[PDB]
Structure formats: structure tokens, C-alpha cells
Amino acid sequence: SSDLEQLCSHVNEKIGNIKKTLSLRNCGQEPTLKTVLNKIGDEIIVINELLNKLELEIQYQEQTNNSLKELCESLEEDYKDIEHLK
Amino acid sequence: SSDLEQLCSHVNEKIGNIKKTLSLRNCGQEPTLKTVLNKIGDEIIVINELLNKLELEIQYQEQTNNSLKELCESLEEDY
Amino acid sequence: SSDLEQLCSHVNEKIGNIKKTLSLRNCGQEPTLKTVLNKIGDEIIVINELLNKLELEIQYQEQTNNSLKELCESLEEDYKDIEHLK
Amino acid sequence: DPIRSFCGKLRSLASTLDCETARLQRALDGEESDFEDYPMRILYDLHSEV
């Protein structure tokens, strides 16, 4: 708003913009960060494969859930016909 | 408005307030101003008396104007 | 005017108010400041007496300066006497 | 009052300019420690999340 405030914001922007370009340099150069960054990045790849496995395991679970029900109509059909005998 | 602007106005007020209290001192002490100020103040007293005279002169003016009508009607009667 | 800005100003006021009460403590306790503060305060007293002297010296000046006129008009009446006595 | 009220704002913009130019140089230079220490701590939290 004011000429004063507008200056401050100009400053914080320069300050902040450095700090960002700072962390960009640090994280891409300094080794201790760079590992923890790859350790996360790798652990993303595995936690991604763990999804695909959970995807298929949900599918065979599904396939089984219906096969259990189509099994369930079968043994629930012939309880009706023996019960008519008895 | 801004902390900056608010300061300025504080300043102008101090500045302006001096300048007024300055002219108050000047006009009430310095002789050349103090005469021209009395010259006006005196010429107010006269231009005030000139009003009272204009007041009475209007009054009789109005007095005579209707007396002048008081005539002009009476002549228009006999014809 | 924002809730954010209003906070900042609350902060600066607390920060600034400390810094003032800080300098008040420093200047009234710490010796090196406290001398330079008395050195100024003393040198005010002298520069004040130097004014009174300049006041009289102006005043004893102003008073012999019209007396340069009183001796000016007296040596003038003497001049018109070389006109008359020559 | 209005004399410092202005300056107080101005001052903070200074103090900020002071403080951050200092540290940002250090950070550029490899000192100051806050800049390799904290991104670690939040990267390690981020890791712990994953």
C-alpha cells in the first residue's frame, strides 16, 4: 500500500527468493540432505510397487468374494429341496 | 493512512502552527503592520457610521417616495 | 489493517519498546556511556555561561554604539564652525 | 509518538536488512548451521511420514 510497505515487500521477496534458491543449492549439493532426499525418493518407488500388489490383491479378493456368493446360492438352493423332503 | 504520511501531517501542523503564531506576533508588535491594521480598523468605524447615515437616508427616501405617490394619486382623481 | 499486519506492529512495538528501555538501562548504568553523557551535560553548562557573556558583550556593544552617535553629533556641530570661523 | 511510530516501522525494515544479509552470506559460505540443520529435520520428518 504505502511507499514504505511496498518497499518492505520488495525486500522480503528478495530475501525469501534467496532463501528458496538457497535450499535448492543445499539440497542439490550438500551430501547429508542429498541422501535423505534419495532415501525418500527410493522409498517412494517401493511404496508405489506396494500399491500395485494391493491392487491385484484387492482384485482376487473381489473375484473370490463373488465365487463365495455363487458358492452360496448353490448350497442355499439344495437346503430348500431337502427341507421339502423333511 | 500511513505512518509516514501521519508524520508529515504532524510536521506541517507544527510548522503551520508556528507560522500563525508568528503572524500573530508580527502584526501585534511590528509597527508598519500595526498601523495598516489600525488604519483598517479605524476605516471600519467610519464605514460603519456611513451605514447609519445610509439607513436614515433610505428611511426618509421611503418616506418621501410614498408622499410623492400620495400626490400622484390625488391628481389622477380630478380629471 | 489486516490481522497479519496488526500482529507485526504489535511485535515491532514490543521489540522497539525493549530497545528503548534497553538504551535507558545502558546509558544509566554502563560507565563509558555514562561519562560521555556527563561530558556533554557539563559542556552544556559552560556553553550556557558562554551565552551570558555573549549577551553582555552584545549589550555593552549596543550601548557604546549609540554613544558613537552622541560623539558623532558633537563633533558635527564643531565642523560647521570651520565654515563660520574661516 | 508519531516520530518513532514511523521510525519503528523503518527500523524493523532495517533490523531485518541487517540480520538477514548477515546470515544469508554465512549460509552462502557454509556457516550459520540453521540452513543445513532444519531442512534436515523437516526432510527427516517427511521421511518418517513416507
Side-chain angles (χ1 to χ4, degrees), chain C residues 21-51:
Chain C
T21 38
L22 195 51
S23 273
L24 213 164
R25 180 215 62 181
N26 278 15
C27 296
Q29 212 150 334
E30 213 267 306
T32 84
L33 295 178
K34 194 198 291 187
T35 63
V36 166
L37 201 118
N38 277 92
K39 282 164 64 179
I40 288 191
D42 286 20
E43 206 141 55
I44 247 73
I45 305 187
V46 1
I47 206 180
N48 173 45
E49 279 306 330
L50 276 170
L51 285 183

Short mmCIF file of all heavy atoms in Angstrom, two decimals, chain C residues 21-51:
data_model
loop_
_atom_site.label_atom_id
_atom_site.label_comp_id
_atom_site.label_asym_id
_atom_site.label_seq_id
_atom_site.Cartn_x
_atom_site.Cartn_y
_atom_site.Cartn_z
N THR C 21 13.97 0.83 26.29
CA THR C 21 14.21 0.60 27.71
C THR C 21 15.58 -0.04 27.93
O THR C 21 16.13 0.00 29.03
CB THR C 21 13.15 -0.27 28.33
OG1 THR C 21 12.77 -1.26 27.39
CG2 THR C 21 11.93 0.58 28.66
N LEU C 22 16.11 -0.60 26.85
CA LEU C 22 17.45 -1.12 26.85
C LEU C 22 18.46 0.02 26.90
O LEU C 22 19.31 0.03 27.79
CB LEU C 22 17.68 -1.95 25.59
CG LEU C 22 18.91 -2.86 25.55
CD1 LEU C 22 19.00 -3.74 26.78
CD2 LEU C 22 18.79 -3.73 24.37
N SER C 23 18.35 0.97 25.97
CA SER C 23 19.28 2.10 25.92
C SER C 23 19.19 2.94 27.18
O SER C 23 20.21 3.43 27.67
CB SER C 23 19.06 2.97 24.68
OG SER C 23 19.80 2.47 23.58
N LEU C 24 17.98 3.08 27.71
CA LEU C 24 17.82 3.70 29.01
C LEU C 24 18.63 3.00 30.11
O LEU C 24 19.26 3.65 30.93
CB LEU C 24 16.35 3.76 29.40
CG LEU C 24 15.94 4.97 30.25
CD1 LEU C 24 14.44 5.11 30.22
CD2 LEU C 24 16.42 4.86 31.69
N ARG C 25 18.63 1.67 30.13
CA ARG C 25 19.44 0.97 31.11
C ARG C 25 20.93 1.14 30.87
O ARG C 25 21.68 1.47 31.79
CB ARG C 25 19.12 -0.52 31.19
CG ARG C 25 19.98 -1.23 32.21
CD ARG C 25 20.31 -2.63 31.77
NE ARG C 25 21.08 -2.70 30.54
CZ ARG C 25 21.46 -3.83 29.95
NH1 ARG C 25 21.15 -5.02 30.50
NH2 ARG C 25 22.16 -3.77 28.82
N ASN C 26 21.36 0.89 29.63
CA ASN C 26 22.76 1.03 29.25
C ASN C 26 23.33 2.40 29.62
O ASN C 26 24.33 2.49 30.35
CB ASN C 26 22.91 0.79 27.74
CG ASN C 26 22.97 -0.69 27.39
OD1 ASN C 26 22.63 -1.57 28.20
ND2 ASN C 26 23.40 -0.98 26.17
N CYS C 27 22.68 3.45 29.13
CA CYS C 27 23.13 4.82 29.32
C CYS C 27 23.14 5.26 30.79
O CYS C 27 23.89 6.17 31.17
CB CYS C 27 22.29 5.78 28.46
SG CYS C 27 22.47 5.52 26.67
N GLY C 28 22.32 4.62 31.62
CA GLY C 28 22.24 4.97 33.03
C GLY C 28 23.00 4.05 33.97
O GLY C 28 22.95 4.20 35.19
N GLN C 29 23.70 3.07 33.40
CA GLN C 29 24.43 2.09 34.19
C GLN C 29 25.86 1.91 33.69
O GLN C 29 26.81 2.13 34.44
CB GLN C 29 23.69 0.75 34.22
CG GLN C 29 23.87 -0.02 35.50
CD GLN C 29 22.67 -0.88 35.81
OE1 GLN C 29 21.55 -0.58 35.40
NE2 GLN C 29 22.89 -1.97 36.55
N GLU C 30 26.00 1.48 32.44
CA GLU C 30 27.31 1.32 31.80
C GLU C 30 28.15 2.60 31.85
O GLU C 30 27.70 3.67 31.43
CB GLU C 30 27.12 0.85 30.36
CG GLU C 30 28.21 -0.07 29.84
CD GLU C 30 29.33 0.67 29.13
OE1 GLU C 30 29.04 1.44 28.19
OE2 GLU C 30 30.50 0.49 29.51
N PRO C 31 29.38 2.51 32.37
CA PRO C 31 30.21 3.67 32.69
C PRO C 31 30.69 4.47 31.48
O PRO C 31 30.68 5.69 31.55
CB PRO C 31 31.41 3.04 33.38
CG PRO C 31 31.52 1.70 32.75
CD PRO C 31 30.11 1.25 32.57
N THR C 32 31.10 3.80 30.40
CA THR C 32 31.69 4.51 29.26
C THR C 32 30.68 5.45 28.61
O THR C 32 31.01 6.56 28.20
CB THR C 32 32.28 3.55 28.21
OG1 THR C 32 31.24 3.12 27.32
CG2 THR C 32 32.88 2.34 28.89
N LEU C 33 29.43 5.00 28.51
CA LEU C 33 28.37 5.88 28.03
C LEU C 33 28.15 6.98 29.06
O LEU C 33 28.03 8.16 28.72
CB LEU C 33 27.07 5.10 27.81
CG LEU C 33 27.04 4.02 26.72
CD1 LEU C 33 25.68 3.33 26.67
CD2 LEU C 33 27.39 4.60 25.37
N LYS C 34 28.11 6.58 30.33
CA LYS C 34 27.69 7.48 31.40
C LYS C 34 28.63 8.66 31.56
O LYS C 34 28.21 9.72 32.00
CB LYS C 34 27.55 6.73 32.73
CG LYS C 34 26.80 7.54 33.79
CD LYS C 34 27.04 7.02 35.19
CE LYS C 34 26.40 5.66 35.40
NZ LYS C 34 26.50 5.23 36.82
N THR C 35 29.90 8.48 31.21
CA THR C 35 30.81 9.62 31.22
C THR C 35 30.52 10.56 30.05
O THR C 35 30.25 11.74 30.25
CB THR C 35 32.30 9.20 31.20
OG1 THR C 35 32.58 8.50 29.98
CG2 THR C 35 32.64 8.33 32.41
N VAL C 36 30.52 10.01 28.82
CA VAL C 36 30.30 10.81 27.61
C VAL C 36 28.97 11.55 27.69
O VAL C 36 28.78 12.60 27.08
CB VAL C 36 30.40 9.93 26.31
CG1 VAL C 36 29.85 10.65 25.09
CG2 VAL C 36 31.86 9.52 26.07
N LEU C 37 28.07 11.02 28.51
CA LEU C 37 26.81 11.68 28.76
C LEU C 37 26.94 12.84 29.74
O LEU C 37 26.29 13.87 29.60
CB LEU C 37 25.79 10.68 29.29
CG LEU C 37 24.38 11.19 29.08
CD1 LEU C 37 23.65 10.23 28.16
CD2 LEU C 37 23.66 11.39 30.42
N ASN C 38 27.79 12.66 30.76
CA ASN C 38 28.10 13.77 31.67
C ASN C 38 29.01 14.83 31.03
O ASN C 38 28.85 16.02 31.29
CB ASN C 38 28.70 13.26 32.98
CG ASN C 38 27.64 12.81 33.97
OD1 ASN C 38 27.26 11.64 34.01
ND2 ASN C 38 27.15 13.75 34.76
N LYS C 39 29.94 14.38 30.19
CA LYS C 39 30.83 15.27 29.44
C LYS C 39 30.04 16.21 28.55
O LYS C 39 30.36 17.38 28.44
CB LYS C 39 31.83 14.47 28.60
CG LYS C 39 33.01 13.90 29.41
CD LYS C 39 33.78 12.81 28.65
CE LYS C 39 34.45 13.33 27.39
NZ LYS C 39 35.21 12.27 26.67
N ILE C 40 29.00 15.70 27.92
CA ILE C 40 28.08 16.54 27.18
C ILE C 40 27.30 17.44 28.13
O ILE C 40 27.23 18.65 27.93
CB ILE C 40 27.10 15.69 26.35
CG1 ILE C 40 27.81 15.05 25.17
CG2 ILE C 40 25.96 16.55 25.84
CD1 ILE C 40 26.88 14.43 24.17
N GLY C 41 26.74 16.85 29.18
CA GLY C 41 25.94 17.58 30.15
C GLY C 41 26.69 18.70 30.84
O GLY C 41 26.10 19.74 31.14
N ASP C 42 27.98 18.48 31.10
CA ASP C 42 28.84 19.52 31.68
C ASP C 42 29.12 20.61 30.64
O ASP C 42 28.97 21.80 30.91
CB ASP C 42 30.15 18.92 32.18
CG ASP C 42 29.99 18.13 33.48
OD1 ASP C 42 28.84 17.73 33.80
OD2 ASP C 42 31.02 17.92 34.18
N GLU C 43 29.52 20.18 29.44
CA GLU C 43 29.81 21.09 28.34
C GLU C 43 28.57 21.89 27.88
O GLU C 43 28.67 22.83 27.09
CB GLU C 43 30.46 20.32 27.19
CG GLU C 43 31.34 21.15 26.31
CD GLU C 43 32.59 20.42 25.86
OE1 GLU C 43 32.46 19.33 25.29
OE2 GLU C 43 33.70 20.95 26.09
N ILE C 44 27.40 21.50 28.37
CA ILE C 44 26.20 22.30 28.16
C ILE C 44 26.22 23.46 29.16
O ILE C 44 25.81 24.58 28.83
CB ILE C 44 24.88 21.46 28.29
CG1 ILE C 44 24.16 21.33 26.94
CG2 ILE C 44 23.92 22.05 29.31
CD1 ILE C 44 24.84 20.41 25.95
N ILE C 45 26.70 23.20 30.37
CA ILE C 45 26.68 24.22 31.41
C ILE C 45 27.61 25.37 31.04
O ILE C 45 27.30 26.54 31.26
CB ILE C 45 27.06 23.63 32.78
CG1 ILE C 45 26.15 22.44 33.12
CG2 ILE C 45 26.95 24.68 33.87
CD1 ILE C 45 26.35 21.91 34.52
N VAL C 46 28.76 25.02 30.46
CA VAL C 46 29.75 26.00 30.06
C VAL C 46 29.29 26.77 28.83
O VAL C 46 29.39 27.99 28.77
CB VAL C 46 31.15 25.36 29.81
CG1 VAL C 46 31.09 23.87 30.03
CG2 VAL C 46 31.66 25.65 28.42
N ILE C 47 28.74 26.05 27.86
CA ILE C 47 28.29 26.67 26.64
C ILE C 47 27.07 27.54 26.97
O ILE C 47 26.66 28.38 26.17
CB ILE C 47 27.98 25.59 25.59
CG1 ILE C 47 28.12 26.13 24.17
CG2 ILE C 47 26.62 24.99 25.82
CD1 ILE C 47 27.81 25.09 23.13
N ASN C 48 26.50 27.33 28.15
CA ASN C 48 25.44 28.19 28.66
C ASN C 48 25.98 29.46 29.27
O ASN C 48 25.39 30.52 29.11
CB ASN C 48 24.59 27.46 29.70
CG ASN C 48 23.58 28.38 30.37
OD1 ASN C 48 22.90 29.17 29.70
ND2 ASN C 48 23.50 28.30 31.69
N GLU C 49 27.09 29.35 29.99
CA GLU C 49 27.72 30.55 30.53
C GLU C 49 28.32 31.41 29.43
O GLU C 49 28.23 32.63 29.48
CB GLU C 49 28.78 30.22 31.59
CG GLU C 49 28.20 29.93 32.96
CD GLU C 49 27.30 31.05 33.47
OE1 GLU C 49 27.53 32.23 33.10
OE2 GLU C 49 26.35 30.75 34.23
N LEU C 50 28.90 30.76 28.43
CA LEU C 50 29.39 31.44 27.24
C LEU C 50 28.32 32.25 26.52
O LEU C 50 28.62 33.16 25.75
CB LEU C 50 29.98 30.44 26.25
CG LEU C 50 31.43 30.00 26.44
CD1 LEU C 50 31.70 28.86 25.52
CD2 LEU C 50 32.35 31.13 26.11
N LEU C 51 27.05 31.92 26.75
CA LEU C 51 25.96 32.70 26.19
C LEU C 51 25.74 33.99 26.97
O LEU C 51 25.61 35.05 26.37
CB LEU C 51 24.67 31.90 26.16
CG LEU C 51 24.61 30.83 25.08
CD1 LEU C 51 23.25 30.16 25.11
CD2 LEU C 51 24.88 31.43 23.72
#
